[PDB]
Amino acid sequence: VDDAINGLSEEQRQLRQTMAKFLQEHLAPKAQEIDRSNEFKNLREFWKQLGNLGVLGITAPVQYGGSGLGYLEHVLVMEEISRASGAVGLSYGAHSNLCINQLVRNGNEAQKEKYLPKLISGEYIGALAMSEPNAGSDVVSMKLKAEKKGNHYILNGNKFWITNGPDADVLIVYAKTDLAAVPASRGITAFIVEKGMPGFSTSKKLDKLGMRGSNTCELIFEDCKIPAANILGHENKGVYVLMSGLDLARLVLAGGPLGLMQAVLDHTIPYLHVREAFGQKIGHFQLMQGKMADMYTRLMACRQYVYNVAKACDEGHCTAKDCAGVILYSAECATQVALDGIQCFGGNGYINDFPMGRFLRDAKLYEIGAGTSEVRRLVIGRAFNAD
Amino acid sequence: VDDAINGLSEEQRQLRQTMAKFLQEHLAPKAQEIDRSNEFKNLREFWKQLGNLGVLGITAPVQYGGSGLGYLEHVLVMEEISRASGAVGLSYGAHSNLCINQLVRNGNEAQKEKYLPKLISGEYIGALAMSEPNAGSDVVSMKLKAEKKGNHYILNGNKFWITNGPDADVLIVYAKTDLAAVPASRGITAFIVEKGMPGFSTSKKLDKLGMRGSNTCELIFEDCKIPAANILGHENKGVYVLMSGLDLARLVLAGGPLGLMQAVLDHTIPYLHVREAFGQKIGHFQLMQGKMADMYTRLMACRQYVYNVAKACDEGHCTAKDCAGVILYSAECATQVALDGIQCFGGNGYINDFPMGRFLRDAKLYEIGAGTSEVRRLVIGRAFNAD
Amino acid sequence: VDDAINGLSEEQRQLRQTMAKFLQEHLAPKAQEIDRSNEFKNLREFWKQLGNLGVLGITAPVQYGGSGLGYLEHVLVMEEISRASGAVGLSYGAHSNLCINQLVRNGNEAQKEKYLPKLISGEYIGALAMSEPNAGSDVVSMKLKAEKKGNHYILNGNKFWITNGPDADVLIVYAKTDLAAVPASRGITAFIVEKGMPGFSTSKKLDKLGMRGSNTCELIFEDCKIPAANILGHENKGVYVLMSGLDLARLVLAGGPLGLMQAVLDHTIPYLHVREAFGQKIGHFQLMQGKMADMYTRLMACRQYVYNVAKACDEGHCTAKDCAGVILYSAECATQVALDGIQCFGGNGYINDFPMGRFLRDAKLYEIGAGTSEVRRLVIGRAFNAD
Amino acid sequence: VDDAINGLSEEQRQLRQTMAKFLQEHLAPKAQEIDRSNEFKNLREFWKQLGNLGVLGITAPVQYGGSGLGYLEHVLVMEEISRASGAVGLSYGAHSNLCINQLVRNGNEAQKEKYLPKLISGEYIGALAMSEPNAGSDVVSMKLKAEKKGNHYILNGNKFWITNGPDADVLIVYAKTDLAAVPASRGITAFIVEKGMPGFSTSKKLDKLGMRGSNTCELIFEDCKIPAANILGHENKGVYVLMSGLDLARLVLAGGPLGLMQAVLDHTIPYLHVREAFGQKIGHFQLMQGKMADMYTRLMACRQYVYNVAKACDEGHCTAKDCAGVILYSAECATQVALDGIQCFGGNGYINDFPMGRFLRDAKLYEIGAGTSEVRRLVIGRAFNAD
Ligand SMILES: CC(C)CC(=O)SCCNC(=O)CCNC(=O)[C@H](O)C(C)(C)COP(=O)(O)OP(=O)(O)OC[C@H]1O[C@@H](n2cnc3c(N)ncnc32)[C@H](O)[C@@H]1OP(=O)(O)O
Ligand SMILES: CC(C)CC(=O)SCCNC(=O)CCNC(=O)[C@H](O)C(C)(C)COP(=O)(O)OP(=O)(O)OC[C@H]1O[C@@H](n2cnc3c(N)ncnc32)[C@H](O)[C@@H]1OP(=O)(O)O
Ligand SMILES: CC(C)CC(=O)SCCNC(=O)CCNC(=O)[C@H](O)C(C)(C)COP(=O)(O)OP(=O)(O)OC[C@H]1O[C@@H](n2cnc3c(N)ncnc32)[C@H](O)[C@@H]1OP(=O)(O)O
Ligand SMILES: CC(C)CC(=O)SCCNC(=O)CCNC(=O)[C@H](O)C(C)(C)COP(=O)(O)OP(=O)(O)OC[C@H]1O[C@@H](n2cnc3c(N)ncnc32)[C@H](O)[C@@H]1OP(=O)(O)O
Ligand SMILES: Cc1cc2nc3c(=O)[nH]c(=O)nc-3n(C[C@H](O)[C@H](O)[C@H](O)COP(=O)(O)OP(=O)(O)OC[C@H]3O[C@@H](n4cnc5c(N)ncnc54)[C@H](O)[C@@H]3O)c2cc1C
Ligand SMILES: Cc1cc2nc3c(=O)[nH]c(=O)nc-3n(C[C@H](O)[C@H](O)[C@H](O)COP(=O)(O)OP(=O)(O)OC[C@H]3O[C@@H](n4cnc5c(N)ncnc54)[C@H](O)[C@@H]3O)c2cc1C
Ligand SMILES: Cc1cc2nc3c(=O)[nH]c(=O)nc-3n(C[C@H](O)[C@H](O)[C@H](O)COP(=O)(O)OP(=O)(O)OC[C@H]3O[C@@H](n4cnc5c(N)ncnc54)[C@H](O)[C@@H]3O)c2cc1C
Ligand SMILES: Cc1cc2nc3c(=O)[nH]c(=O)nc-3n(C[C@H](O)[C@H](O)[C@H](O)COP(=O)(O)OP(=O)(O)OC[C@H]3O[C@@H](n4cnc5c(N)ncnc54)[C@H](O)[C@@H]3O)c2cc1C
Known about the structure:
4 copies of one chain form a homotetramer. Chain A is an alpha+beta fold. In chain A, strand 2 and strand 3 (152-163) form a beta hairpin. Chain A has helices spanning 10-23, 31-37, 43-53, 71-80, 89-105, 116-119, 238-252, 255-272, 286-313, 320-345, 356-363, 365-368, 373-386; strands at residues 126-129, 145-148, 152-163, 170-176, 188-194, 200-202, 216-221, 226-227, 231-232, 276-277, 280-281. Chain A is globular, with a radius of gyration of 21 Å. In chain A, the strands form 3 sheets. In chain A, strands 2, 3, 6, 7 and 8 form a 5-stranded antiparallel sheet that branches. Chain A has a 4-stranded mixed sheet with strand order 1-4-5-9. In chain A, strands 10-11 form a two-stranded antiparallel ribbon. Chains in contact: A-B, A-C, A-D, B-C, B-D, C-D. The interface between C and D is large, with 50 and 48 residues. One flavin-adenine dinucleotide sits between chains B (94, 98, 128, 130-131, 136-138, 161-163, 211, 216, 365, 368-369, 371-372, 374-375, 378) and D (275, 277-278, 282, 285, 287-288, 343-344, 346-348, 350).
């Protein structure tokens, strides 16, 4: 059970309680089938249910269908998410933060009414596309060329590791319109892709080590046709557009490993008080007590950091350095906390009948996915050397 | 050099910068001298100057000349003083908190009026006497006993590890008044001991690896005739007074590790931007940028943790688990950050001309001071075993 | 490429090269399919091929068809087999040490002549039964009753976590004959059961996070008739063979983590030179170089530790504390090395298409299998309380 | 004590006990005073005794009174010396391996015949000059010029971090005779500087954080006439000596942290059994036992690694990667071992009355005094990029 020490207001505590009472019996009781089969049978039904509660538009205003709240509520609702089921935790972050908010913050009035009323209401699924096989860390070195032939841009190339690939209806794909410019950041341009366009196609879904349930595949572009009105931001100026959502991504996705740590704690604490060894409960031994103390301290340290950074972001003070730091620290702590939680179960933490191994495989994503720790360390270093 | 992520109000921000300009001219330039001489010559003058600023009774009510603020302001002042000088910060905390809070929470109407004015004004120094040479963590096994000689208490025994021993004019000493009770805790009772009483003396100031300049000695009680009116709390109720102050001293002293971890960064970052190696500044190498990023993220996480836990205790919801967890995490992270901060200076960090060695030696105290790193995990674990 | 720094004889190097050549042709390509399907159809054929090489009874006397080599060569073979497939390595460790090495040290002449030749030639598979569903770490608290009538023992009860269960032909099952004895340790008796006895029914295989391909099932004994000649050790004093087997099983099993670290290094080090980022190979970045340095140093330190401890056991300098220490250190280092190896690949380490995901799930077993990691710390700590 | 696990053959184990007894009867009761006064009054007598005992010049061949043994004996002697007194360990390492090894390897017949007879017996002190005030890690960027005038070399520059500066009678100082070469490494040249030459002087001793007692000061060169016969190796080829000797220096100095953490454990283990709390010895609690297990495992692993690497170099298999890796791992482990040892003592470990405070300060030198960990990881990293 979570306490009010996190600094949440009455409305935020009520929202957390509502998420806790709603995710149970609907999501969590079926995270083990999703993990075993890597498929969500009622994904669209669950998305429609989420759209009714307004969690998809937690940051978007009520004008377009959202709730009109801040990023603190987003990082809060993304901690309840991925807690009951870590599998579907990445899909919500890729839908709301990566696609909806990107159109809300850097979109025009025309584009802000065709896709967002569909995405916020859960009718369509959104996703972001920047990575590619030749550029997974060096995002400014893309190879997808975009040639102009009037009022339509033809995308040609290939991208990899696109979250929610086979099921997203609106995809924000970044492409290079000027591959001959000396500054690599001046050639990138954002585009809006909709399912059913000619030339666009999705490849086979990947069988990832962990986080199975969040669909991911390969995008193939062969003589595409996107109108000029679907350009997100401005042409040859996608540098600030790209590296603005990547910061809110690190800020909001930091709640992911927080939910994983909360889940492994809610699964570890009762188990240590029911399992007995050497005539006593295993929870009374000093080593298990120290493990629980370390896990609780790490969770409480990672939870207050992200929440305070989100509170600072909701007033005008934003920094990519802190947004990367909170998520890298959360992932680095969650990996060790999942390791300790598997260690506390012994033999039972190894079989697939317990979510111990699942939470371990899920925790490893945030360290390599959505930006590796090396990239974040280099960003913090460059931010420290600039001053 | 701090950031607004802490979420402190404008009034709390004023106290942050007020102590910043004061300590950098009154305490910072003499930190090396206090460390190498192990004697604060201006101790009483600095205490009176701080009492003029109102930071001593910052948690005391406004009736006795205090400030009336909360624990967060005391924590931030402690952090600033520890950043200026870790040795003086420990003494400031162990005086202000461990005397004024203990007197206002359990002292009667007469004891508060008698001692608090001159304690807040800086004329009287305070200290807490709970540890013993044979009982550091096991405080319930103390050997100091008290016997009722009519309307008087004859205290016999010794106390060890007392901060500001020879300097404190009013000291809170716990003494066992009964030994026939089945529970060992039911015999401990708190007493107020003044300086100069018959039978009270100090042996000698001891030398420590770190925190040099903070006076610590051994208390010797030889038939000390403490009056019955100097009893703190009630008869045979000292453990409830001790454990209450024990949980609060861990939260307040958390700024010490925070102050040291802020000072190592304030001294390290400007150094990497000056020294050059292999034809470029050392701050541009990835191995240094990664360490700087790790240290900054750890410092910010610990600071947000402490600041959020402090706010919860002012609302009226305090726990003993969180108070031990925050200080344990802060001490460990400050030690691990100072370890890298000394290495970042290379050969220059291994000499006494730079305060990095002092920052490292002062960081180890909070892992073996104000409790123990091992007993904190035990207290945290026993909280889950009781639920 | 292994270095001669390990301090091995020429014959040991030749054996290592022969094992590397044999496993690369027969086991290395199909290593991924065994993990994907959790089945080894060529198990008996591969076991026969190993028996033709003499590595199954490498620690057994030559009179039974074994090689008569020391524990160092056994650790070498374990590291080589775990280098290609971790599950096959665990199976070989459970076969050659838990069953074969147990009979040569505490079995009679007839019991050895009856079982060892088929176990060495690959005809019979060996297994050990210590763990129980209600006693995983506290093996002394086993409840398997072994009451006897005449010249037969009536075993009744279930045991869990039996490696090579469904495929084993000769199994060593520890049972408790006298449950009312005051000494809890002096009530265990080891019995040598075999496939075909009425009442020995094996359960289905267990799906686990790693080591896929090793058949682990629950044994069920219901009024089985075990002859009085199939007794390992002495009656009512089976605790001594149980701890003698436990002290030496942790030494040979240390090659598992060593083989996994060798595999992840031989997969990462070449991969860092055939991957490009920012116009350069990823292996030239200082952070990746530091990761390589840490992984190489940890692998080398653990390997030298295990080798020097194994060589000491060949001259009678055995110690349970050293074996627990080496197995704990090897598991803890292999876990971190497998975690770091995935980060070096980036995204290509989070999919089943690359073996980086398999080696991590297999390395986690060594921290909970064959004794919990905390139990190892307790065993090591109790070894200093008697000096 | 020690175990035969290290594989120490005859004439090596007896030397260990001999050194232990010698240092416990001579050096052990003086380490505290050496660390306190930052000086070693009995330096010349100690060096004479070491020369008479045959430990000085252990690696030197048997021509001038050397022992002619392998590096393993030197490693264990350095380990024992650092275990007795860490401050004297750095001086012994700089004397026996930093100076003598360069003389026996690259020194010609007439050169080594003049200095070694007066250097092995303990008369002269052997110092080394590589780093500079503006070049700590970038040793090839030295600015010490050496102009050639007939058969005389005139050096004009400054050095820093010179161990045993004012006491050394012969100093191997690298000078850049050609500042106009295309490769920066081809310009440096090693020269044998002797005390008493005109234009040579030394500054006052440095006040370091740790290693108090090992003299270190700045070297001053002003028109110092160096004879042409005092050249080491060949002209413009000084890099092929410095780079080839720095690996052996890092290898031999790796025994320092080994003996440091050995003394840490030898002081911690009896204290955990004598000190009692909560009605029993503190050494019986699970946390203390786990810390003891971790420290013992780390010490044994590092010792076995260093010994196995030293055995390889005795057979003619030297590598630059392993020599840096072993000392890096040893220092990084000894730091944490000293931290845990200080933690296990509690409050008593914080005062300078116990040697636990010196162990932490001495362990930090091997991370910055023998090349930083970053440079070591870079050297290890570059070893893989060359394949
Ligand atoms: C919502 C979505 C985007 C979330 C995701 O999950 S996407 C991430 C996955 N792909 C990746 O490649 C990992 C990210 N990669 C990195 O961070 C790399 O370290 C790179 C930054 C790309 C390094 O490549 P490099 O060519 O050196 O790029 P620079 O560092 O020099 O970029 C400087 C230019 O970026 C822009 N920028 C930086 N910070 C911000 C900001 N807070 N808001 C808006 N714009 C920003 C800035 O305008 C600058 O432009 P120029 O001065 O170069 O013209
Ligand atoms: C300046 C600087 C460097 C240092 C400082 O000034 S800080 C002071 C130094 N700190 C210390 O020495 C640590 C001493 N204490 C401890 O470590 C812990 O308190 C423990 C040793 C784990 C206490 O354990 P133990 O001896 O078993 O005693 P118990 O826990 O069983 O408690 C017995 C009685 O404790 C009292 N207690 C415990 N928690 C609280 C609470 N949250 N509020 C009020 N009272 C509490 C409680 O009354 C209990 O009594 P009963 O249950 O018998 O009725
Ligand atoms: C290979 C792979 C596929 C499969 C695997 O995973 S291997 C599976 C095997 N490993 C396990 O099952 C782990 C189980 N863990 C353990 O057994 C632990 O040792 C513990 C049972 C927790 C130890 O706890 P506990 O027995 O209560 O501690 P005690 O001090 O009371 O034990 C004393 C008894 O030790 C026994 N002992 C006999 N020989 C030795 C010997 N040469 N060295 C050390 N101990 C020995 C001795 O019998 C004594 O009991 P008493 O009869 O004297 O009372
Ligand atoms: C307290 C006391 C007892 C212990 C001490 O204080 S000892 C050491 C204190 N001083 C230091 O740690 C600084 C040492 N500095 C370094 O090692 C450097 O920073 C390096 C990481 C090697 C970087 O050197 P860098 O400037 O990049 O130059 P290079 O790496 O290209 O090498 C220069 C030339 O050396 C050659 N070299 C490298 N290794 C060896 C070898 N094992 N034997 C013989 N020659 C070698 C290499 O070929 C190169 O030649 P050129 O290509 O320039 O012609
Ligand atoms: C106002 C005040 C100021 C102080 N200032 C200082 C100061 O500046 N410097 C200073 O050094 N000390 C100071 N002390 C003393 C400090 O409280 C003790 O040093 C500390 O609590 C424990 O150290 P110890 O050696 O005295 O206790 P010990 O109990 O002897 O500690 C020894 C070790 O035993 C371990 N241990 C004990 N019980 C258990 C258990 N059940 N399980 C596992 N491990 C256990 C502890 O963790 C510790 O590692 C101060 C005390 C007071 C009251
Ligand atoms: C005989 C001898 C004895 C010595 N004895 C001592 C002694 O007793 N005590 C002592 O303190 N010193 C001693 N020194 C000096 C010591 O060897 C140097 O201080 C050491 O090499 C590190 O140098 P620096 O810190 O001055 O280099 P710096 O450049 O100051 O190092 C600062 C930081 O820069 C980093 N850095 C440099 N290059 C890179 C890179 N390419 N990538 C990433 N990071 C980098 C370093 O890693 C380090 O973390 C001695 C030197 C010699 C020659
Ligand atoms: C031949 C054989 C082969 C096996 N093969 C496998 C295999 O392939 N895979 C597999 O998963 N398992 C295997 N096992 C089971 C494995 O040995 C047990 O899982 C292991 O001993 C731990 O058991 P447990 O988790 O059931 O014990 P539990 O008691 O359930 O352990 C749970 C937790 O309690 C803690 N604990 C217990 N006592 C103490 C104490 N005194 N202090 C502190 N903490 C304590 C442990 O550290 C652990 O964290 C095998 C067993 C045998 C006999
Ligand atoms: C919208 C979106 C969705 C995503 N979804 C997922 C997902 O569902 N699952 C997932 O795992 N990931 C996801 N990612 C992360 C991204 O796909 C990662 O790049 C992923 O790990 C694929 O890796 P890669 O091998 O293509 O690139 P990388 O992860 O970068 O791998 C390349 C390797 O090169 C090295 N390298 C490159 N430059 C440097 C340097 N300067 N210093 C040191 N090393 C360097 C790396 O650190 C890394 O080891 C997503 C990213 C985005 C933007």
